[PDB]
Amino acid sequence: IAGFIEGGWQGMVDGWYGYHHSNEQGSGYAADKESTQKAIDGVTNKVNSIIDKMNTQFEAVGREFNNLERRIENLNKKMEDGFLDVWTYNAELLVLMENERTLDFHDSNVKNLYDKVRLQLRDNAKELGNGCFEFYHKCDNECMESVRNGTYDYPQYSEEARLKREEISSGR
Amino acid sequence: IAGFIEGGWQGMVDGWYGYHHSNEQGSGYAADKESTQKAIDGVTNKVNSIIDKMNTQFEAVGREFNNLERRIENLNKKMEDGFLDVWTYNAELLVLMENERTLDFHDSNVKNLYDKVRLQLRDNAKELGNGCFEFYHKCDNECMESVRNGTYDYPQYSEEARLKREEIS
Amino acid sequence: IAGFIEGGWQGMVDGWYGYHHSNEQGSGYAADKESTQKAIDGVTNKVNSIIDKMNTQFEAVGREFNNLERRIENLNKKMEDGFLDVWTYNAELLVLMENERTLDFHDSNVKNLYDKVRLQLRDNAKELGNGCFEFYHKCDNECMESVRNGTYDYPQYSEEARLKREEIS
Amino acid sequence: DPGDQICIGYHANNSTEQVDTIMEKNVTVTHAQDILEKTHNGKLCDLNGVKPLILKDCSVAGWLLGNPMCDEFIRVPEWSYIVERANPANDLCYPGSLNDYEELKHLLSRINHFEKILIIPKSSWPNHETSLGVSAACPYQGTPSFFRNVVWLIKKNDAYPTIKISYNNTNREDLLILWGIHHSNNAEEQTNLYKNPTTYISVGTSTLNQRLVPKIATRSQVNGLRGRMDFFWTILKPNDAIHFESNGNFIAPEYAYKIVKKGDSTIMKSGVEYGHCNTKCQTPVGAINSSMPFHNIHPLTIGECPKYVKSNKLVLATGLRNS
Amino acid sequence: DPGDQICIGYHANNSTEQVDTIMEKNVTVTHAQDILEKTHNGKLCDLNGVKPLILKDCSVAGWLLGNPMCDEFIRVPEWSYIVERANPANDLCYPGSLNDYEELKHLLSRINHFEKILIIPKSSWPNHETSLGVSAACPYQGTPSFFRNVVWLIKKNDAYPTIKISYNNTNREDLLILWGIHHSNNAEEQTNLYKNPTTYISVGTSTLNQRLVPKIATRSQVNGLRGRMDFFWTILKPNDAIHFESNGNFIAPEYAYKIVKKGDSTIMKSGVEYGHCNTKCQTPVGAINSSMPFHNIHPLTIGECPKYVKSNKLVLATGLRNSP
Amino acid sequence: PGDQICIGYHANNSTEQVDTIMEKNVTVTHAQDILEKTHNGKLCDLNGVKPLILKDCSVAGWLLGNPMCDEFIRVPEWSYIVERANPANDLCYPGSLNDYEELKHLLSRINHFEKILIIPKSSWPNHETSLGVSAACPYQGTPSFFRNVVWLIKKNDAYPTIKISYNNTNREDLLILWGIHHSNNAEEQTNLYKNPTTYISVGTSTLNQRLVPKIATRSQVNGLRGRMDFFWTILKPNDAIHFESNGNFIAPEYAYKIVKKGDSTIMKSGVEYGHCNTKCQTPVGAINSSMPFHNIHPLTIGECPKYVKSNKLVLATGLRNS
Numbered sequence A: 001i002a003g004f005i006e007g008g009w010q011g012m013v014d015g016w017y018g019y020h021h022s023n024e025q026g027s028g029y030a031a032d033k034e035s036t037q038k039a040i041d042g043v044t045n046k047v048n049s050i051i052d053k054m055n056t057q058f059e060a061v062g063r064e065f066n067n068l069e070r071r072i073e074n075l076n077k078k079m080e081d082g083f084l085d086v087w088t089y090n091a092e093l094l095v096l097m098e099n100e101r102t103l104d105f106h107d108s109n110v111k112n113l114y115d116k117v118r119l120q121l122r123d124n125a126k127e128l129g130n131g132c133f134e135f136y137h138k139c140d141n142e143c144m145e146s147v148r149n150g151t152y153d154y155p156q157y158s159e160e161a162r163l164k165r166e167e168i169s170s171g172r
Numbered sequence B, C: 001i002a003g004f005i006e007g008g009w010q011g012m013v014d015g016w017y018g019y020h021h022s023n024e025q026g027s028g029y030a031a032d033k034e035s036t037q038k039a040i041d042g043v044t045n046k047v048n049s050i051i052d053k054m055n056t057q058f059e060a061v062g063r064e065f066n067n068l069e070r071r072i073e074n075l076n077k078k079m080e081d082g083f084l085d086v087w088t089y090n091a092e093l094l095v096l097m098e099n100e101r102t103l104d105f106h107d108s109n110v111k112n113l114y115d116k117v118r119l120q121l122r123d124n125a126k127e128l129g130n131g132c133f134e135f136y137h138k139c140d141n142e143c144m145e146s147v148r149n150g151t152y153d154y155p156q157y158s159e160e161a162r163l164k165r166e167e168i169s
Numbered sequence D: 001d002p003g004d005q006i007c008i009g010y011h012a013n014n015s016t017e018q019v020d021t022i023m024e025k026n027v028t029v030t031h032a033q034d035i036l037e038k039t040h041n042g043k044l045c046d047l048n049g050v051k052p053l054i055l056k057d058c059s060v061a062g063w064l065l066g067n068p069m070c071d072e073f074i075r076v077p078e079w080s081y082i083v084e085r086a087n088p089a090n091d092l093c094y095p096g097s098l099n100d101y102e103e104l105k106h107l108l109s110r111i112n113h114f115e116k117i118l119i120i121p122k123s124s125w126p127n128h129e130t131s132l133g134v135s136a137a138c139p140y141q142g143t144p145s146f147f148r149n150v151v152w153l154i155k156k157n158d159a160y161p162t163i164k165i166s167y168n169n170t171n172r173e174d175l176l177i178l179w180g181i182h183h184s185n186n187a188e189e190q191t192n193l194y195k196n197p198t199t200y201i202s203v204g205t206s207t208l209n210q211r212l213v214p215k216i217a218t219r220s221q222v223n224g225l226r227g228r229m230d231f232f233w234t235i236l237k238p239n240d241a242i243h244f245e246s247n248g249n250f251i252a253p254e255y256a257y258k259i260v261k262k263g264d265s266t267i268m269k270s271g272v273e274y275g276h277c278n279t280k281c282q283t284p285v286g287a288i289n290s291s292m293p294f295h296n297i298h299p300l301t302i303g304e305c306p307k308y309v310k311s312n313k314l315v316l317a318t319g320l321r322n323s
Numbered sequence E: 001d002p003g004d005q006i007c008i009g010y011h012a013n014n015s016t017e018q019v020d021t022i023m024e025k026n027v028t029v030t031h032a033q034d035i036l037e038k039t040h041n042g043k044l045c046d047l048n049g050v051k052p053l054i055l056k057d058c059s060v061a062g063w064l065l066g067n068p069m070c071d072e073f074i075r076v077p078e079w080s081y082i083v084e085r086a087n088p089a090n091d092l093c094y095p096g097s098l099n100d101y102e103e104l105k106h107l108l109s110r111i112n113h114f115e116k117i118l119i120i121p122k123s124s125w126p127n128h129e130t131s132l133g134v135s136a137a138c139p140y141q142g143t144p145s146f147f148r149n150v151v152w153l154i155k156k157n158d159a160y161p162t163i164k165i166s167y168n169n170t171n172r173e174d175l176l177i178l179w180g181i182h183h184s185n186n187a188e189e190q191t192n193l194y195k196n197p198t199t200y201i202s203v204g205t206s207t208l209n210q211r212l213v214p215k216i217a218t219r220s221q222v223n224g225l226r227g228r229m230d231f232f233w234t235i236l237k238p239n240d241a242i243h244f245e246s247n248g249n250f251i252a253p254e255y256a257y258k259i260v261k262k263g264d265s266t267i268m269k270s271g272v273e274y275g276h277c278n279t280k281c282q283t284p285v286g287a288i289n290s291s292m293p294f295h296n297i298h299p300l301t302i303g304e305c306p307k308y309v310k311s312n313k314l315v316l317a318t319g320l321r322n323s324p
Numbered sequence F: 001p002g003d004q005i006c007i008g009y010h011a012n013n014s015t016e017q018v019d020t021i022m023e024k025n026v027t028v029t030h031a032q033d034i035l036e037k038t039h040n041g042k043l044c045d046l047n048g049v050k051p052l053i054l055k056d057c058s059v060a061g062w063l064l065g066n067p068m069c070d071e072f073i074r075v076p077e078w079s080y081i082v083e084r085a086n087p088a089n090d091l092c093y094p095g096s097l098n099d100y101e102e103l104k105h106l107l108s109r110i111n112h113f114e115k116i117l118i119i120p121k122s123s124w125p126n127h128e129t130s131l132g133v134s135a136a137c138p139y140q141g142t143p144s145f146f147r148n149v150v151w152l153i154k155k156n157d158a159y160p161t162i163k164i165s166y167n168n169t170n171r172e173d174l175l176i177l178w179g180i181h182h183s184n185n186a187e188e189q190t191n192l193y194k195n196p197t198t199y200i201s202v203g204t205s206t207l208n209q210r211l212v213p214k215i216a217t218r219s220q221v222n223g224l225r226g227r228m229d230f231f232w233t234i235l236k237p238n239d240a241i242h243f244e245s246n247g248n249f250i251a252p253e254y255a256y257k258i259v260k261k262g263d264s265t266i267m268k269s270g271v272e273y274g275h276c277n278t279k280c281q282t283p284v285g286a287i288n289s290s291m292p293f294h295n296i297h298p299l300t301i302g303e304c305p306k307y308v309k310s311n312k313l314v315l316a317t318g319l320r321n322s
């Protein structure tokens, strides 16, 4: 299973961002609760802000001018069309800008999760370039969980990782 | 010969983003077609969206009130000046905000292209800090194209690089 | 900032972004004057632009319509309320949008500052995962300046750093 | 080849919802939310709990003056807005005009309390004929009739004594009072109806100083009648009195309307049926929900409504990119 | 022998074009695009294919009533907007007024069909003089004259019989009909022109019921005359009839205007000449293009126009940051 | 280990909070408010010109010269007009002033204002000039009348026809006011003007007006069933106004030299004047014009920030703080 650089996971059905592991105990998916919940809060606030910050009051819109008051009727027409153009232009552009902001917001969160993992593993693992890391050592389910939270023990596996790193690079 | 850290390349004129190979066979420039075209289609949409989303209808603006209709004329003045202030304020800030985004959009594309090559080469080359990689192995013009078109074969030169990595003191 | 630095230096009072060092000669803070000045100038421009770009002209708003001009008065009421809603909505959302970008702008600057130091040091120092680098050699105050100045001399310490690496792992 | 691996990725599902960004068009996302209101219920509802006043095929003028083709038992004591039709079929049946009509319609658009009362009974004119003022222009059951709320006074015994009558508003509310003047066709018709060649109508209150003179001239037939009747109105504040003086051509008040106004509204032109519903925003084609900030239904709304835009969709991306 | 290298870089050229950002002013870029319309052709053009009605030295009131000093052509049966000057030279040779003038000007700003026709020829008045209704304030070729589309009726044989006339609009289109009343200066002038001391004018349609009475009083001299002539207009719908009744001071209609109206426009005050061009947006200083969403030329626009802004520059950066 | 270098950023003790699109109440090191929220609570000069403050008089009562009005015109120029809630001194004799709203709009901002005498009472040698007196217009509990206008009455049971002219030789526009009196009945009409049927003809280069009294029964206002309708015109320089009447004429005595260079509006406020200057005035007080938005009052005069329905507009200028 590839990672974020390739596309989304249909197997991730419990969160927005998360992990997929593959060891000798099998594979599986695990979502990052904190970054998923905070992202959901931010998008929820953004949508609510766009809706709740609009001020509306009572207005009675009609046509109460006779055939010898056409100049005033034209003034009403110019005002109504002017407000139509202002709201139409602002609403279309605002949605386009905020949609771009939201999709860029998702990309940053995924990269931050990737960079947190890459810092822990250091040279104990190899970056495949698809969003995945191949471990230069055996990483069981408890080891995988230590990467998902921030408790990965680099010096524990460094000796094993070093031996297997040289074999791969020498062509063995 | 500089990289992105220094500045732009007047030599590269066939694209927005690209490479500059320098092996024993000579020097030259290359342009990444995909990221330039993807970025070109981007700002083109942004320019069109700012222009095409404007809704316009027929309007007739004149002064059609007599000397005893000054209150109604004042209402027209306040309406016209009000829409003048709204459009002037929004148009200028929109240009300022979108120009900032467009320039930042270019920085992200350059960094992503550098990071793509960095992942491909890994330790087969050396990061020089100016935006260029120096190879630990002989990389010919076909070897350059593998980096550019994404088919760089790391294990082909893995042992050659490791001997040059180790023996260099 | 970006899941990287816990952040917050009460000791740093002379700049927005910068460094902290610690060696045999001692420790201390040093603000990066370049990034701070560009950020201060940039942010100052944003606040001024949001304020300066507003066009204001003379207007007199009163209630100048008698009891048999209620249709005209309702026309004025609709115009005033429409402009009240346009400005209130635009001002509220512009502040929310720009406040988001300004805070993201600050994060972008600190991340780039970290990357420039990492770009210089490379294997001569070890990333600690909290925004700090641990040198593999002896870096005096003159050496620390070169890192802050962006002109760190990697070849000077590469051989000594490599020896200290293998004396650990 | 593959060893132990850990990967970073994100949610994808089967959704086909599409949003647009400033730089890309038709981007598929996992979840999206539309902020544009596009649906109406196709009924005329109450506005904030108050029923509208729906004049079926009558106009405000015909309804007020009591056109016999209008239901006179219309008993809506309070309303939030008035629904006329595009071209009401029952205007002033006898040709003429209602003075300051548009301002009167705006004044009556929303009324807190509305009650018709009898102020000047037909027994108040002992020296004039009160039952001979009927016309074929205002038929009822086919045969001639007249506006129900006003009296068309006629000469009695070939005499039209000068009228001097005043009404003092002893009620606690404002009174809407209507009266009219009849422009006759010629001298012979003027003498047949009122016996006085030169006539006048003077109306006086604390703030009203009116003097009306008939315009006797040749005119073309409208509704089969060459004469005209011009109607006027005033709001008689409590404890104030209205004074009438006329020696002919006087269309006297009989019924007035106690009126209490506590807000302004407008007249809606629509043929949609009443629906026994309620809404905060009413449009000529139906009621709409006012939760979303924008709508594209109709510009002639009453109430608290989203801003009207010329747009088909305003959909925000609230999920991740799908592929 | 030297280590081979691969580098990452971006485009730079010799462009000096600059844009502004929210945080940086005066930023040089490789390419940029303006979205502000800042030019105008300096001519008066057709609007959506329809040529405007240009009154050179005449106001609308003088053009309608037929001021003899207004060199007329009456070649335009349709127009999109009316071009007047700020101070038209010939408006009303005999001093007076045209009632509801501003509303009438709004009505005639855009006309789909316009054709002057004769509705009441001077033969219709056998018992009134039709050749003496003439003034020195309305000269033509050195001879006293009058408005050419109305007739100033005068007593004949020291008699002004009561006029009772009627006209039915048997045409298929609306009819614009104008008439007026003459305000005398004293009793002697009243009986000289009309022989009747107390006079009136009765005008009636299905929608109009008007009675006018002269205001014989002392006034200031305007254009050499102390009298006044107030003019009125109505739109006679097809198959409707207008009724006139008068015993003096009547400025009777002679010519009316067959008029068809679909759209609405306004009146433009401009001295710039016609240029045999076409546009979708016209300003008093010249026509402008409507491609861009904003413009700063003029606020008094007619047509489908960009939004008027108080800005001198709106450039969108499309290229990259540049160091030339 | 040893020899570390770290990357960090500024933090301080600031508790200032701003709102963003995705997060609420984000504490920052420094902030900036762009919303004007305060007023000084006084009426000030508008761009260096003092307003015209009618204390207890309306415009009509001030112009026509209500005998109770203290029409101080110490200010020959004003930028706007301040009216209070209930002016005691209004049209004391019941009636109206034609085009009053347009007249008040015209007088809102006046560059030059001077009251001058154009027709002295000596000009009516065959009419009574001192009996034009009414209890609806008291002076000290004693019946009186408007001071700038004269109510002419018959003398020796005769009201000879009036034919007077005035020519504007003042090089400035003149605001002239006059009126017609509507009597109550036939006997009252002859007891005042001796002529049962009367008229007023007013003529200028642009005005052709004829007025006839409307005898009718009306309700008592200020103790009187009679009415007076007042009219005004602006007399251009070198132009003349011609009056002709045979009864019910409220003849002008004083006029006003007028120079108008700009427009304003009437402000309704009870606050006091405070010897200050401002570019934006509100009925509750003056506000500064530096900020782009304000929330004080919608009825502003001057160059003002955009009025919004917001209580807080704070821009984040510093770093996030924790």
Ligand SMILES: CC(=O)N[C@H]1[C@H](O[C@@H]2[C@@H](O)[C@H](O)O[C@H](CO)[C@@H]2O)O[C@H](CO)[C@@H](O)[C@@H]1O[C@@H]1O[C@H](CO)[C@H](O)[C@H](O[C@]2(C(=O)O)C[C@H](O)[C@@H](NC(C)=O)[C@H]([C@H](O)[C@H](O)CO)O2)[C@H]1O
Pocket: F131, F132, F133, F134, F135, F136, F143, F151, F153, F182, F183, F184, F188, F192, F223, F224, F225, F226, F227
């Ligand atoms: C003269 C007077 O005050 N009459 C008074 C009348 O008084 C009689 C009294 O003559 C008789 O001897 O004994 C009677 C015993 O009951 C009685 O006392 O009483 C009637 C009944 O209430 C009063 O209406 C009447 O008062 C006058 O009435 C006028 C209308 O009829 C009018 O209202 C008068 O008010 C003035 C005013 O002060 O405005 C009087 C002014 O002198 C007069 N000014 C001029 C220039 O003529 C003015 C004017 O008539 C009207 O404003 C015109 O519309 O009216 C009021 O005194």
Ligand SMILES: *[C@@H]1O[C@H](CO)[C@@H](O[C@@H]2O[C@H](CO)[C@@H](O[C@@H]3O[C@H](CO)[C@@H](O)[C@H](O)[C@@H]3O)[C@H](O)[C@H]2NC(C)=O)[C@H](O)[C@H]1NC(C)=O
Pocket: A141, A142, A143, A145, A146, A147, A149, A150, A151
């Ligand atoms: C962060 O990740 C680490 C690494 O997995 C978690 O610690 C480890 O948790 C596992 C699962 O509970 C522990 O294994 C279990 O231990 C007990 C004790 O012998 C035994 O009953 C079970 O059979 C099983 O092996 C493991 O010991 C533990 N390792 C430690 C603590 O060093 C840790 O819990 C994670 N933290 C959070 C907050 O999620």
Ligand SMILES: *[C@@H]1O[C@H](CO)[C@@H](O[C@@H]2O[C@H](CO)[C@@H](O[C@@H]3O[C@H](CO)[C@@H](O)[C@H](O)[C@@H]3O)[C@H](O)[C@H]2NC(C)=O)[C@H](O)[C@H]1NC(C)=O
Pocket: D220, D221, E168, E169, E170, E239, E240, E241
């Ligand atoms: C102005 O002239 C028009 C046209 O002559 C007059 O309208 C015409 O009026 C006559 C009689 O009222 C109509 O004749 C009737 O027509 C119907 C068929 O539609 C038939 O049932 C009747 O027996 C009768 O003959 C005629 O149709 C009608 N024509 C039009 C075009 O409307 C009009 O009345 C005149 N206006 C005035 C004010 O006199």
Ligand SMILES: *[C@@H]1O[C@H](CO)[C@@H](O[C@@H]2O[C@H](CO)[C@@H](O[C@@H]3O[C@H](CO)[C@@H](O)[C@H](O)[C@@H]3O)[C@H](O)[C@H]2NC(C)=O)[C@H](O)[C@H]1NC(C)=O
Pocket: F167, F168, F169, F170, F238, F239, F240
């Ligand atoms: C109303 O009063 C004004 C203000 O004085 C009058 O305007 C002036 O009228 C006089 C004659 O009435 C004009 O005469 C000029 O006199 C000198 C001296 O001979 C001469 O140099 C000039 O050629 C001229 O004739 C004077 O131009 C004129 N002033 C202005 C500024 O127009 C006006 O005439 C009076 N109206 C009436 C009806 O009397």
Ligand SMILES: *[C@@H]1O[C@H](CO)[C@@H](O[C@@H]2O[C@H](CO)[C@@H](O)[C@H](O)[C@H]2NC(C)=O)[C@H](O)[C@H]1NC(C)=O
Pocket: D168, D169, D170, D239, D240, D241, F219
């Ligand atoms: C209408 O009638 C009311 C009630 O009769 C009159 O008001 C009274 O007026 C008298 C003096 O005439 C006062 O003493 C009473 O106190 C008043 N009563 C109330 C309840 O106001 C009123 O004047 C009449 N309106 C007229 C005559 O125009």
Ligand SMILES: *[C@@H]1O[C@H](CO)[C@@H](O)[C@H](O)[C@H]1NC(C)=O
Pocket: B141, B142, B143, B144, B145, B146, B149, B151
């Ligand atoms: C990619 O580059 C390699 C190395 O030069 C070459 O063999 C291969 O054909 C290239 N592929 C494409 C699609 O250009």
Ligand SMILES: *[C@@H]1O[C@H](CO)[C@@H](O)[C@H](O)[C@H]1NC(C)=O
Pocket: D039, D040, D041, D287, D288, D289
């Ligand atoms: C309005 O919203 C309600 C739920 O609050 C929904 O049931 C109803 O169908 C909506 N009506 C329209 C016309 O959108």
Ligand SMILES: *[C@@H]1O[C@H](CO)[C@@H](O)[C@H](O)[C@H]1NC(C)=O
Pocket: E025, E026
């Ligand atoms: C740069 O901005 C300054 C601000 O003072 C302005 O004067 C100058 O004109 C700008 N540059 C150019 C090339 O116009």
Ligand SMILES: *[C@@H]1O[C@H](CO)[C@@H](O)[C@H](O)[C@H]1NC(C)=O
Pocket: E039, E040, E041, E287, E288, E289
């Ligand atoms: C409009 O576009 C034309 C054609 O590109 C150009 O010649 C002209 O200058 C532009 N501006 C005008 C007419 O204001």
Ligand SMILES: *[C@@H]1O[C@H](CO)[C@@H](O)[C@H](O)[C@H]1NC(C)=O
Pocket: F024, F025
């Ligand atoms: C922000 O803080 C204020 C007071 O400091 C409080 O009233 C408000 O509710 C807070 N906002 C949220 C979203 O909790």
Ligand SMILES: *[C@@H]1O[C@H](CO)[C@@H](O)[C@H](O)[C@H]1NC(C)=O
Pocket: F038, F039, F040, F286, F287, F288
């Ligand atoms: C306006 O600014 C002044 C100083 O310029 C300040 O003292 C005052 O508080 C501000 N606000 C007012 C008058 O509402």
